[PDB]
Amino acid sequence: ADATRIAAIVAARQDIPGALLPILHEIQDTQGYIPDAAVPVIARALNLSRAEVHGVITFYHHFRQQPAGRHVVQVCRAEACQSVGAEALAEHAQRALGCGFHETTADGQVTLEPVYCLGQCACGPAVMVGEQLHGYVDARRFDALVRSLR
């Protein structure tokens, strides 16, 4: 993570109304995560306390405080995907990858995350990798798309 770029990211946004979430997004988008060492920089620029900033980072599931694997694979767990087999897909994904949700494979290639609806509810089970969507995902298609990543 590039500490100097983080300071610039914060400085460019520090007068935006409600700048904290846009700042956290830009740090995560460019560095991969929000490092603990960025919190004092954010806090000072926004005249917020460090605990306040850390509490926001902790509250929102989208934000991560440590790097993910090369690819974040999100498997939808919500109702419409459930109705067409999301539960079995989630069980298979953990067996095929060898790790649970919120975990990263041993080779560091895939981080498996749940997501609660991708707005793909009529063509599930739905999976997102980075920003690439996949519909109608069964065990075969899952293994295929994971193969493509590696």
């Binding site: 109304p17 409600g18 700048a19 904290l20 979430l21 846009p22 956290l24 997004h25 926004l46 917020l48 306040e52 509490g55 926001v56 509250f59 929102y60 599931h61 989208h62 934000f63 919500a78 109702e79 419409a80 995907c81 459930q82 109705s83 067409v84 539960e87 997501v115 609660y116 609806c117 991708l118 707005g119 793909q120 509810c121 009529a122 063509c123 599930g124 739905a126 997102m128 920003e131 969507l133 996949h134 519909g135 109608y136």
Partner: protein, 512 residues
């Protein structure tokens, strides 16, 4: 000299089903055959079982093929694609497909017809006609027009939109805001997503009319982080509208000012609650605010704030362009207008069905949906999202109308419809409702934050077959605690799927 226009959708559902690969295969095939095509990346018509849905402009109108995979493209060319030749995947003239033709697409009129980022396409199909009329009215007249239309909040609470705007207009404040709630966190919903990806200018126009109606010069679209495509498309559209004078400090030379920006959410379902949304916009944890102060009076940064759902705002332009009485004539009772219903889940023909209020669930399930994807019988349908009740077949003939659903404990909500077939385990559904509440609780209320997890534990005992009668009673008790001790609908409506599952399918819980 001769160029054939081909449409390949760029809606994220079409993209999830391979539309970019189809578009590249069509381009590669045209080049291999020395034929000239213009591949327009339209929104989606919303017939998702046919996506990617390729359309070709012919003398007879646009004809459709679907669903198309990249491997099908050489055969499509061989069968005469560029002339609308018949193929296994042919669907005929697109506007003649009954699923699409038998709709009342007031809000979704352009969706799938246009290039979503083309101002020329937008304005060739009535785009900005509502804004042009609104620029010639006094603010109170715009409020009155939206009032007369009968429009109610399409986020689900169905509060009369014009009354909401009247409050913001009448408030005394130099700074007022328009806030679009694009958090669309409910499973089974994608109508907001489709507006933002497939007809973004309509949302921009609707928010600009709202700004004119109440005296706001700044707007914010709060879009969930799960929708990266919507966010990218809205940002491009805002840039394009600004460059052409539809936004900024001198909109179309009127001297009216409106600036708009997109804010990305961060994975919290509860930020669809309007005050938790405001907290997030202001950079804080998404904790629901006590609501003796209405956001319409003290909202974003304590200023008078219009907060409306994407569909609510996106319906404002047609209300202005065609008039309140035209809009009000659709529907039934107090449910005036149309709603983009969303058919989702275990559904054979899922997608977007905009219809006047009063259509029944059975009509949508059978006449449009074609039954389940699996072919098994429908067993339970959750309407209105994860906080809606499960409906059994005995309720499928209630008209989809806010008051008629409320009367029996149904929730129209945003109009999303999630179909479960006979394999569904309603005890596992009840457990999930509790798990989801435990995951998403903002934490302010004890029954929501901790009671939900105890409900999971008890449901686990029920699913393992341990003392079903005792533990169902405990769940019932916990539900009453949530009904009476929740400060917003996350905790307060979690009992709706739980109690409807338990009441309608007690056999799944081990009971008689």
């Amino acid at each position: 000299i001769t160029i054939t226009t081909i449409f390949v959708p760029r809606d994220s559902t079409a993209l999830a089903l391979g539309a970019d690969d189809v578009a590249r295969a069509i381009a590669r095939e045209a080049a291999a055959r020395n034929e000239h095509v213009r591949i327009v990346r339209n929104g989606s018509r919303g017939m998702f079982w046919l996506e990617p849905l390729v359309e070709v402009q012919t003398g007879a109108g646009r004809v459709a093929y679907g669903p198309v995979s990249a491997a099908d493209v050489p055969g499509l060319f061989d069968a005469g694609l560029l002339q609308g030749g018949e193929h296994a995947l042919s669907q005929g003239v697109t506007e003649e497909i009954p699923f699409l033709k038998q709709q009342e697409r007031l809000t979704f009129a352009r969706v799938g017809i246009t290039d979503p980022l083309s101002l020329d396409d937008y304005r060739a199909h009535e785009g900005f006609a509502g804004l042009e009329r609104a620029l010639a009215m006094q603010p109170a007249e715009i409020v009155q027009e939206v009032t007369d239309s009968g429009l109610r909040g399409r986020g689900g609470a169905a509060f009369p939109t014009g009354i909401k705007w009247k409050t913001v207009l009448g408030a005394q404040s130099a700074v007022k805001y328009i806030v679009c709630n694009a958090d669309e966190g409910d499973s089974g919903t994608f109508s907001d997503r489709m507006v933002m990806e497939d007809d973004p200018f309509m949302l921009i126009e609707g928010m600009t009319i709202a700004a004119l109606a109440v005296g706001a010069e700044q707007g914010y679209i709060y879009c969930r982080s799960e929708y990266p495509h919507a966010i990218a498309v809205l940002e491009s559209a805002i840039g394009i509208a600004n460059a052409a004078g539809w936004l900024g400090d001198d909109i179309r030379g009127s001297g009216k000012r409106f600036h708009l920006e997109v804010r990305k959410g961060a994975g919290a379902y509860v930020c669809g609650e309007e005050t938790a949304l405001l907290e997030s916009l202001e950079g804080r944890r998404g904790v629901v605010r006590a609501k003796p102060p209405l956001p319409a009076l003290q909202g974003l940064f304590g200023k008078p704030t219009v907060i409306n759902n994407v569909i609510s705002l996106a319906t404002v332009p047609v209300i202005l362009a065609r008039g309140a009485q035209y809009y009000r004539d659709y529907g039934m009772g107090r449910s005036r207008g149309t709603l983009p219903f969303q058919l989702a889940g275990n559904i054979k023909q899922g997608g977007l069905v905009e219809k006047a209020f009063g259509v029944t669930l059975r009509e949508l399930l059978v006449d449009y949906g074609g039954g389940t994807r699996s072919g098994r019988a429908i067993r339970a349908v959750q309407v209105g999202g994860p906080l809606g009740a499960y409906l059994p077949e005995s309720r499928f003939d209630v008209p989809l109308d806010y008051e008629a659903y409320a009367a029996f404990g149904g929730v129209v909500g945003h109009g999303g419809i999630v179909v479960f077939d006979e394999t569904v385990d309603m005890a596992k559904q009840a457990r999930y409702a509790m798990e989801f509440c435990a995951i998403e609780s903002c934490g302010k209320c004890t029954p929501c934050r901790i009671g939900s997890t105890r409900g999971v534990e008890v449901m686990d005992r029920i699913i393992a077959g341990e003392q079903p009668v005792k533990h169902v009673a405990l769940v019932r008790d916990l539900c009453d605690t949530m009904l009476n001790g929740s400060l917003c609908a996350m905790g307060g409506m979690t009992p709706y799927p739980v109690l409807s599952a338990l009441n309608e399918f007690p056999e799944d819980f081990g009971l008689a």
